[PDB]
Design an enzyme around this catalytic site. Structure first.
Site: not given
Lengths: 219, 218
Positions: A136, A169, A175, A179
């Site tokens: 994403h 995220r 995440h 990340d």
């Protein structure tokens, strides 16, 4: 609807990215602390945004960035742009992050702490996908940059929203902060690779005129 | 010797970057730990590489990137690339980072802990320069992307070296990790802005021709 390039043409993210933080590494301590800060604002405005940012369906992606880029994006009004959005998700969200993802198969935070994310429906899918790096994030970063190349005057707004899209995220529980940090760099690297591809350049030229057209201007 | 765009034509870093981690923020505790992790290996090879990476004169950037890009970089064999390197330092290392730098005037780690860096020479200059975001980082990220555009066969090598170049700033004691992470985003954003400037495109065409010239490969 063919991606601008094949999977093999993405720069090997496994080669240029550092490995994810190890168990006793300060960076992982940060990831865990960052995870819980996001969990604390569960149910707040920012947290609801993270839930919306979780959905990468072209429709939702157009709805989100239309105001930022300052133009109505739709199948009918902006054909090339509509395809550009989907194409970039393919090369940036998936192809660009593939080798690194499979190589490490990092576990996601919500799995580790056995918690629920901000978008429960996507959880069975996430569990099967390596956490590092974030797709994403790579997509949003890449997207922000491509739109900034098309409508330069909205650069600061695009850069900002691109950044927050990634942070969602972390806040969503999908995440680790690390990340996302790596995903931004992957998006930049893919962006540079696209510049050398004719198919991309042709598409951009058309995207540029659609988003600069007076009839598609939005406030 | 003409910059691609003026200081006012770069995207405002103060607007799109988040504020630097504060004293009690998780990200800040990580910054301190990262600082000491690097101060600990002072005098080792990685640390020595950091001092090397600290020098951004054109001659040193060329020495470091010639092997990575796979072509000789000299004022005589690749004049255009030579100017490109210097021009990118102005717009990406300085212009692109200015607004965020001056607005936060973030204190540098070596100043806060009373220690010396991997390159004392710069310390007097660093003292009066906002730490957030890192100028060396934005520059190397930008450089890496532009060269990848000129010679994509070396994209991965370039992307890795670019990353490490930014990490040297942390290991060197000149920046906090958060300044480096921010610097990479600035590098990408500025990279996007350059694409729309004719002077740049025209310069890139020549750079691509020089770096792919058989008479210039290693």
């Amino acid at each position: 609807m063919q991606p601008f390039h094949s999977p093999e043409e993405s720069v090997n993210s496994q080669f240029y990215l550092p490995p994810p933080p190890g168990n006793d590494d300060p960076a992982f301590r940060y990831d865990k602390e960052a995870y819980f800060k996001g969990y604390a604002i569960k149910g707040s405005p920012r947290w609801k945004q993270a839930a919306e940012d979780a959905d990468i369906s072209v429709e939702n992606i157009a709805r989100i960035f239309s105001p930022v880029v300052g133009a109505k994006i739709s199948p009918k009004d902006t054909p090339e742009t509509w395809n550009m959005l989907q194409n970039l998700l393919k090369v940036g969200g998936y192809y660009a992050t593939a080798s690194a993802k499979k190589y490490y198969m990092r576990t996601r935070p919500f799995v580790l702490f056995n918690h629920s994310t901000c978008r429960p429906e996507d959880e069975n899918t996430l569990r099967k996908d390596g956490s590092y790096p974030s797709g994403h994030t790579a997509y949003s970063t890449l997207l922000a940059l491509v739109l900034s190349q098309a409508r330069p005057e909205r650069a600061q707004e695009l850069a900002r929203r691109g950044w927050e899209f990634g942070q969602s995220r972390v806040i969503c529980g999908a995440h680790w902060q690390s990340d996302v940090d790596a995903g931004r760099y992957v998006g930049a690297v893919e962006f540079a690779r696209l510049q050398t591809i004719p198919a991309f350049q042709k598409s951009l030229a058309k995207v540029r005129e659609e988003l600069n057209d007076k009839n598609n201007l939005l406030s």
